[PDB]
Amino acid sequence: NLLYLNSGEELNLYPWNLYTGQEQELFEEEIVSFAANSVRILGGGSWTDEELYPLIKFRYSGQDLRFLKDMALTEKDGRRYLVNMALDPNGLCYFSYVNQDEREATADEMDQALGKLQEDWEKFLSDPLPAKTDNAFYMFFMRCQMLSDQMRKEQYSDYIGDNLYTIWELVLKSEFTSLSYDNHIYAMYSNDGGTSMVLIYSPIEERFVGFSLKY
Amino acid sequence: NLLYLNSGEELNLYPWNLYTGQEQELFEEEIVSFAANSVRILGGGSWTDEELYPLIKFRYSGQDLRFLKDMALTEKDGRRYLVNMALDPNGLCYFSYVNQDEREATADEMDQALGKLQEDWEKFLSDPLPKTDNAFYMFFMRCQMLSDQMRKEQYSDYIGDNLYTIWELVLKSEFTSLSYDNHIYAMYSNDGGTSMVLIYSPIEERFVGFSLKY
């Protein structure tokens, strides 16, 4: 039942479909600060601002997009990651934190991961504002909320807070569909009005390692 | 059951993932002749060479790819099409002929289309070398006619070898599918990394394109 995409298929999540490769490096400190904190809170690494700032190089598009493409990081224990991010006029619309050396999940692990995801989702639907957890939805929403709070506490620009309700509401009210691509499960949600999202689930880590949100 | 991709998902089939927009217009008469005939035989319109030749503007890539992107044609009855094609070193690796004014299939029509496809496939598996509304037979017969046409006029046949590969994939791989952009993408692949997609229109009840990657 889980659909896999084949080698002849490239799947680009919003807004990478708009990426041309002509975008121009542009340093904006509030975006850099937000991205450094996104790496720590959404991704989970320990790098400091002093280590990340020199590596966070956003590229600006005349479509009013900012892209951070394949920023390479190495954890203190040697794990290698690529971080991708993007901002559009509504804020943070894409984040992913992907371990480049993770093992390939077997067919059975993928199926089990999809089962866990379904179970976590049903628990979320029964209790979407719970009052601690290995529920992937709860963990991901709590990280998103912490990022927003972290930015507001520091009075820096909060590029995720305006999107939190929409993300929650999509998971709550949409049908959950999925496919497998590139050793991840893409959990897909959308509404009648054209808003859609993909949550990027790692079956190895048993958590969401990214998302794409398109209004 | 049938998976639909959502508005935040762009699916590029090989070799459009390699397209950069820096490719340079390059006229090669054997490619143009092959493409004109592909439009008439794979797509099915009646445009003459005089109408198509000035519009067939392939763009060349230093990766050894030739792309024809969004060529706009208007059929005799006013239907508007976009034609997309690409060639790589093994020949025609992408073709699509897409009516821009077709209506949106309903959920039920999509499901019925998927049913017809599955039935056509099982008939093909029972008789793969057999007049017909079988999508697989129609597509292969059109590919065959195109290959014969190219031999007849002694130009390069950019479809013949790939026709064999496609036939074999369809005969021997698992058939999986998803819905994207009002079409069904019928996906086939083998252990060695070769994969293909056949682009099925539920409105036309036929294959309107394909992508093949060795």
Which of A3, A7, A17 lies closest to B176 in CB terms? A3
Burial grade of A205 (CB within 10 A; 0-12, 13-18, 19 or more): middle
What span, in angstroms and rounded, lies between the C-alpha atoms of A170 and B155? 55
CB-based contact B6 A188, cutoff 8 Å? yes
Residue B80: which H helix or E strand, with range?
strand B80-88
Question: Which approach determined this entry?
Answer: X-ray
CB-based contact B14 A8, cutoff 8 Å? yes
Which residues face A74 on adjacent strands?
A: A80
Q: Where are the alpha helices (DSSP H) in chain A?
A: 29-38, 49-52, 107-126, 136-153, 164-173
CB-based contact A214 B8, cutoff 8 Å? yes
Q: Which residues of B fall within a CB distance of 8 Å from A8?
A: 13-14, 189, 195-197, 211-213
Instruction: List phi, psi (to 5°) of B46.
Output: -105, 5
Interface test with B, best of A1, A4, A5, A6 (most B CBs within 10 A): A6
The structural domains of chain A, with segments of one domain joined by +, span 1-215
A89: nearest Cα among A107, A111, A65, A112: A65
B54 preceded by cis ω (within 30°)?
no
B31: nearest Cα among B151, B167, B158: B158
Residue in B with minimal Cα distance to A189: B6
Alpha-carbon distance values, A157 to A24, A63, A140, A141, B54 (Å): 22, 21, 21, 19, 53
B47: nearest Cα among B76, B72, B86: B76
What span, in angstroms and rounded, lies between the C-alpha atoms of A69 and A60? 11
What span, in angstroms and rounded, lies between the C-alpha atoms of A63 and A60? 8
The reported resolution of this PDB entry, expressed in Å, is 2.1
- Give me the count of residues in chain A: 215
Residue located via tokens 């949409």: A174
A130 preceded by cis ω (within 30°)?
no
Q: Is the CB of residue B84 less than 8 Å from the CB of residue B71?
A: yes
Residue in A with minimal Cα distance to B192: A7
Taken in order A154, A155, A160, A161, the sign of the CA dihedral is positive
Terminal-to-terminal C-alpha distance of chain B = 29
Q: Using DSSP, how many helices (H) and how many strands (E) does chain A show?
A: 5, 10
Q: Is the CB of residue B139 less than 8 Å from the CB of residue B117?
A: no
